[PDB]
Amino acid sequence: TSPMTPDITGKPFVAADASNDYIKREVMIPMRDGVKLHTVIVLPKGAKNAPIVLTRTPYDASGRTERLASPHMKDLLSAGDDVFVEGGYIRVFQDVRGKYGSEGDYVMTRPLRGPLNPSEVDHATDAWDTIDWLVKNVSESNGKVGMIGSSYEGFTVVMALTNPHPALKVAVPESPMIDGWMGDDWFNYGAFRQVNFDYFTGQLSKRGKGAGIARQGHDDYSNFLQAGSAGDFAKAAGLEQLPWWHKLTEHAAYDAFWQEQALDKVMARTPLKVPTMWLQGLWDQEDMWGAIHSYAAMEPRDKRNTLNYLVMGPWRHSQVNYDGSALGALNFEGDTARQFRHDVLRPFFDQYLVDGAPKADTPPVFIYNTGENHWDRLKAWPRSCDKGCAATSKPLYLQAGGKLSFQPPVAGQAGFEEYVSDPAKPVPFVPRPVDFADRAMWTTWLVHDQRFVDGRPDVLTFVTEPLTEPLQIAGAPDVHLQASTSGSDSDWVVKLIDVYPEEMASNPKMGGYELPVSLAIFRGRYRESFSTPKPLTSNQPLAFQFGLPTANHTFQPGHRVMVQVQSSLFPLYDRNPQTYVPNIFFAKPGDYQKATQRVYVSPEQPSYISLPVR
Amino acid sequence: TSPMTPDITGKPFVAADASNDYIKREVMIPMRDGVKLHTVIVLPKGAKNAPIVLTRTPYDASGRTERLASPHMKDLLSAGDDVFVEGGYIRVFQDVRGKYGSEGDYVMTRPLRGPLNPSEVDHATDAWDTIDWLVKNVSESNGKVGMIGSSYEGFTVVMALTNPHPALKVAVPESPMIDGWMGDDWFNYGAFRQVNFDYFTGQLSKRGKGAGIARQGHDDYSNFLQAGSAGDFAKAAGLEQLPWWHKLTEHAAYDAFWQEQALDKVMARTPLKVPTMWLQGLWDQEDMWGAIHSYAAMEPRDKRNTLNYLVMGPWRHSQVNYDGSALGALNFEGDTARQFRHDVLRPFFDQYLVDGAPKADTPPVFIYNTGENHWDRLKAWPRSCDKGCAATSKPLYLQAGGKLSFQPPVAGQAGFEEYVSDPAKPVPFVPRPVDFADRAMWTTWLVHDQRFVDGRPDVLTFVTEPLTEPLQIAGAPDVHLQASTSGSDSDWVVKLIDVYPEEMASNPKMGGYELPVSLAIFRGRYRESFSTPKPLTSNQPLAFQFGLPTANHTFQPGHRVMVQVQSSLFPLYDRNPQTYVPNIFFAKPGDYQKATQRVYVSPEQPSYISLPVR
Amino acid sequence: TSPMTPDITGKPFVAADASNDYIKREVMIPMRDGVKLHTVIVLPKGAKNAPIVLTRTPYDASGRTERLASPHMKDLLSAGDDVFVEGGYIRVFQDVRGKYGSEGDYVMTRPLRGPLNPSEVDHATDAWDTIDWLVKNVSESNGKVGMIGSSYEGFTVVMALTNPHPALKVAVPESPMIDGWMGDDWFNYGAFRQVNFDYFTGQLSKRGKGAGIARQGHDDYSNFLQAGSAGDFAKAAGLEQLPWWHKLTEHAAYDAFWQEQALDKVMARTPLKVPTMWLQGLWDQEDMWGAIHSYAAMEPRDKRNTLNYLVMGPWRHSQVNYDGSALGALNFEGDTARQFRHDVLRPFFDQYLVDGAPKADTPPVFIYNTGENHWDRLKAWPRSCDKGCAATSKPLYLQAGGKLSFQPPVAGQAGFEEYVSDPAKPVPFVPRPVDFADRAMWTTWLVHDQRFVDGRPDVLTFVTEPLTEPLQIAGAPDVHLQASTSGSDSDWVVKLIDVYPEEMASNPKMGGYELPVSLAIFRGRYRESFSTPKPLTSNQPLAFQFGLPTANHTFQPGHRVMVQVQSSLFPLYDRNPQTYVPNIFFAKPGDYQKATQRVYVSPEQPSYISLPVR
Ligand SMILES: [Ca+2]
Ligand SMILES: [Ca+2]
Ligand SMILES: [Ca+2]
């Protein structure tokens, strides 16, 4: 070999694959319009009549099938695919239209053929053509296909369910994106989520891998506050080059653009034919709305209770595919994620995909009790609600003096609790400094101790005396807030908290820990209507009604129930200027004003939470 | 904005840069043969008559100038560039010929025009054409250029020094690759370094970013042992596709291929014209030979002591560009890396690059004492050696019964210490499991406590009684080993160790800690000649002589001096089969045999280390 | 208040107790012979007809009832007492005779009235007199008592069971000290345990709190090796002042002194009257022999299977009273300790102690499967043994070339595997440096990855190929070692190991992890008799038979089964000098000699482990 022989030959370096216990095949599958989608198929060596598990993703199919470069399939594929490797399944990941190895144009959460999409293709037809090709060209398969995926990967499963290929025998949409305005990714009750600015450049900058937005500093509390409004931050970052950004600001309210994209409404008029398991985390910080709302839209038509299932674990977004033994300071009884994957998911998929496999005794509802630390196998959910459930909700009244109880307010006390909300000094949603990039912070923010803001003058705290008997809730709490603002707009944040016993000697850090079981924010301008915003009348007590995330939680003896109320949750949510403007995205510096907020706790105007007690 | 408007546009997304305090400018510089090299220039805004600091790298110039996407130049550039940002320098990184954005073919450490390179270009001409272009095309510059870089980036500096452009006013080769066979990257005294297998696929798989090699498991001790020889592992990993791998196995001995690449020999015949500062770490685990040998090759001709400098800090490879406050369990007196960059490097560069800058009080030698924890400013180095230095070396004799002293062996005792070296059960160079991916393990292996192998039957341990007075060494120890093997080949590993006081109450983990101050391996087949290997005569005591890494270390009172001897250091070094084979890279399973080793400690055949005491 | 008024008044400072939810009373209960024992009684406020849980301890009753100075009983008492606080029990801790607040003389594990104790009192009579006083003087109780305790606190429960007071309705000896010579605290098959030297000064220096032994250095590997024999270390430390030390060295063999103290032999002749639950950890590093052997001594007479229970969790010594969610690098399915305490222990105690309490569904055997990670509820144990069990044991033969399989050795291979055992360089039982005071090291040593010694020339390794199907063992493995030694004595250490799959991508550190499922040491001089030691015939293959710790473990697919054999386990066990001496405690420097060890693996003399497969 000559010394001047180029050490980089130019020809592709073929990695070793002799010792592999799998085969990886990449193929460009033509859709009905000629556009080919990059599809990666991983088969166990010696696979015969094996089912296929398919996932359609905008997060790199080649990368999703290489958690680690390894000759062992169990290590090659992600942690969440462990049960599929153990079951001898063929795993397939496909790049959606317009991303990574696939051809075509990319449209964020490409809408269904209809009012928003006049083309001949969408995610439903793309999944159909994909499945058709797989059962006709993968000789190692038995022609049976199951679909699974979390977040955007769950959204593609839902799209396939709108009109599924006959070969699709089972589906598991995990934390799917269903309604990005009401309560999933983009907004929550109209309040815009700034955490997704990095997602926009990360997914829309290039066909393939993108990047986050360069910051002025480390603390996002400071980065966003200094920039001003959400529109100011975006403009300075160059986001006006992205059509998606223009779509968000042109549709700030819940108009036809968002209504026509709500997939739970679509599931309501979609016939039940494919056994589907709606899954999400109880602390799903990205898609809290999706799974539970989609499950409820189809459950009334699940006549025999064997086609529509619900799964809600003690998980943060997508934790179902990793280790569910803990979340932040909370410890659970074993790896709850692995428990779900092995005890419930595997037998459910085997029943519909593996030849000769027995029927599984899949629980209609598989939900974790975050207070008692154990799974619950039920026939229905919720167990308690205002009407139609086994148990009836009980009003939990906010009381004067920062108290909280099931007894209606008595006369002869202060009619309300007051606090000033200052947009220039907003309440932080997590301890400063805030780093949206820090995955540890973002995935655990919903279970973080709230004492870092308890005692702030712009946060109201209501608490019960220590419980002597366990209080079990099992449903979706509903806020019935009676509040006024001296401004003409305002956000209202309510947190339902489990305060641990003041002392916890066996785990000292948990002593007095304020765990948010369920919390939400509501953009006040949408009080009467989500599609048609209106200014709030200054200094007038008004009724605000909105649901808090689902909870299957027992407040144990020694614990207290607590409710915190505030008017900002920054920088996760852009600040409500507190003066009515046409579009908060483009609020001007002078529009931001302090406002005197009042939460009423009188017999005539009682604030309370309809708690799903059982 | 229509809903179907592609969210990923035809016109690429461009990040905003209005708040930037620098300007990044890319250029394609044509070399003399027409090949263009991708060059990245980072200028402070308002830069005028500013000096340039240039680095030529095979590690992505665009990546090297983006430690963090940020509007602040200090954060955008690497930690090691802090003093250049503070000094208002224009920073330039260039992709070497055949890598990343550059055109041309890539040849690993492209040799100088000569016997190994018949072309008209090499790193010397490329650096010359680059500097000529920069001074004629960067209007913001004062036409003065300084070069710096660590490892391969240091190697490109040395290549420029063979025939430097008149505009090159100063050079700082940090841990440069000088002799990859004698003691730098590829081999150490002929013993092959398996840690670089991942580097081959990482740098030679493609023009741009490559990847590591997929392992069968987590523990490299097991991965390499199970594979067999280095050639078996490489063959299985698909490395026979890389011409570099064939160059290594075709030139296992120190033949013309390696002799013609030794840059210290080139420096010996290179006139001293550009002020040069040779730098490396005392614990440089990748390029231990380079800087010190190159410095010594030029120092005798440094008439006024102002053209050739030496710097040796308490660092691992490239730590000079990060934080030097500690290394593994060792704590030093402040951030020694920052101290060097600010107190020595900055004034040195300024003196020769900034118009009208003052004279720097640059110490001819800047070397850290790892035993007293402070820098030493000296006029010469070494301070002690066999002859020609201020102090003279003293033999430190290995003794029977595992003893060690400066007194020659006495009669009436065992003439040797014996151990069996078994290739099937080699001595680990770091505690198992060995993870070559774990950067923390690799960067700190040389300072790791050796108690994890002390007490093994295949490792001999010689130790003094606790010292009552400080023992200072300041030079390069030289091993004079008298040893026999029952086989026909063998490796000899010698570690000079500082054993800390048995108790260290203020830092308990340091109690009895066995810190290797200096260690080296020698491949026995090269005992008589590095170019002509010969079998070792079975059962015959033979003299081996080889140098240990430089040390400026004071063994303090309460400490002991220790020497460990073994015949494997795995998996860092491939195993010597202990039977004489033509090429150890291709040793067969049956070639590996146990061997009875004897280290002689008698008056007639005394093993000792020539210690550079002062 | 005058400025010169002494700030320390001299009168006792009464801590506030108004807010306490408990009442703490201290009383000196007179025994049969007039000697009063300090007893601490903790009653919940408003206690009426409450049962008592009693523990007798030599570890400070006042300290045991104050985990934290707190007004909440749950936090005041230890973590393990959580279920008793929840159950409204009165908790009592009593200082044993001669310790802390109690009067009388202290005798280590004071033997029962008989040949070793001619006095009128022992732990049985002391417990009787205590229980009698409690039911007659504690008006807040219902006159029913349960006993519990771990280690020495479990030993006092067993002493009460030899002749229990009628008021004792239930007992739970946890990791009790049963046979301190055969396999509990002082020795293991005659091999002396040096870890207890600190225990001797800690418990025998003073009536109250003692201290450990001052060391020369940090590393006990070095401290003990430098001192020489166990006797040399003890003499230098001043331990000849302690009668206990003289008792140990005067009874090095299993003579009448130890036979008369073996409580499992006493339980074999003790009528089953009190529902007893024998408990220990599978990795009980202090009392591995006790619970399982005592359970087996009484189970044949448990006619209705309702008076004798067994519990073996995935625990280290006493972990049952803390958090059992993990042990070292091992993760279990939830807090297994809390699971046992709440799901099994609480209902078991309530049934026999609380008025009108319901029947508990107590599993006859509650044993954790360390390979499948789940509890097993069985009617009997073991599930597999040589004869009389549901399954029969299968021989796992050690093979030449470091192999292992269920197939008998074939001819034509090497008849044995050889290694030299050097007492001057013993095999470490845990990575150096060894610190017996480091609780983290000591509690997790039995589950530590054994790769730190795998590959040592003085440790033999035998391993199977990767398993394709699960291999479940459920019983006590029995070693049938055929081995010789060139010396006249030797220790034999055997480890049964579960080697995790080479790669574990979801938990990288577990890749190739060598987990010791079960290990034991056997002092060779007791090959034919534990009471009468005899020299081993030099170079003659001899049969060694001894049991390994119980295992309920499934070696899963991908894992390998491994067996390691060595002749030292230092410094936990003193070194066998390898030349026969009358008493190893007083071995002289010249008695320690290297010895050539041979483990036979031929068809004629096959070494194997009788594995309890099912
Ligand atoms: Ca259903
Ligand atoms: Ca000089
Ligand atoms: Ca029983």
Question: Can you give keywords for this protein?
Answer:
3 chains; part of a larger assembly; 10-stranded mixed beta sheet; 26% strand; alpha+beta; hydrolase; alpha-amino acid ester hydrolase ( Helical cap domain); Jelly Rolls; binds calcium ion; alpha/beta hydrolase; 614 residues
SSE diagram, text form:
The structure is cut from a larger assembly and holds 3 copies of chain A (614 residues).
Chain A: E1 22-30, E2 36-44, E3 50-57, H1 61-64, H2 73-76, H3 82-86, E4 90-95, H4 123-137, E5 141-150, H5 152-161, E6 168-174, E7 187-188, E8 191-192, H6 197-204, H7 220-227, H8 230-237, H9 243-250, H10 256-259, H11 263-268, E9 276-281, H12 290-298, E10 308-313, E11 326-327, E12 330-331, H13 336-353, E13 365-369, E14 374-378, E15 384-385, E16 391-392, E17 394-399, E18 403-405, E19 416-421, H14 439-444, E20 460-463, E21 471-475, E22 478-485, E23 491-499, E24 514-523, E25 542-547, E26 551-555, E27 560-566, E28 595-600, E29 608-611
The complex binds calcium ion (3 copies).
One calcium ion binds at residues 299, 302, 305, 308-309, 364 of chain C.
Task: Describe the overall structure.
This is part of a larger assembly, with 3 copies of chain A (614 residues). Chain A has 614 residues and is of the alpha+beta class. Chain A has 3 domains: 271 residues, Alpha/Beta hydrolase fold, catalytic domain (Rossmann fold), CATH 3.40.50.1820; 67 residues, alpha-amino acid ester hydrolase ( Helical cap domain) (Orthogonal Bundle); 238 residues, Jelly Rolls. In chain A, 18% of the residues lie in helices and 26% in strands. Chain A contains 14 helices and 29 strands. In chain A, strands 1-2-4-3-5-6-9-10-13-14 form a 10-stranded mixed β-sheet, sandwiched between helices. In chain A, strands 17, 18, 19, 22, 25, 28 and 29 form a 7-stranded antiparallel β-sheet that branches. Chain A has a 4-stranded antiparallel β-sheet with strand order 20-27-23-24, with no helix packed on it. In chain A, helix 4 crosses helix 5. Chains in contact: A-B, A-C, B-C. One calcium ion binds next to strand 10 of chain B.
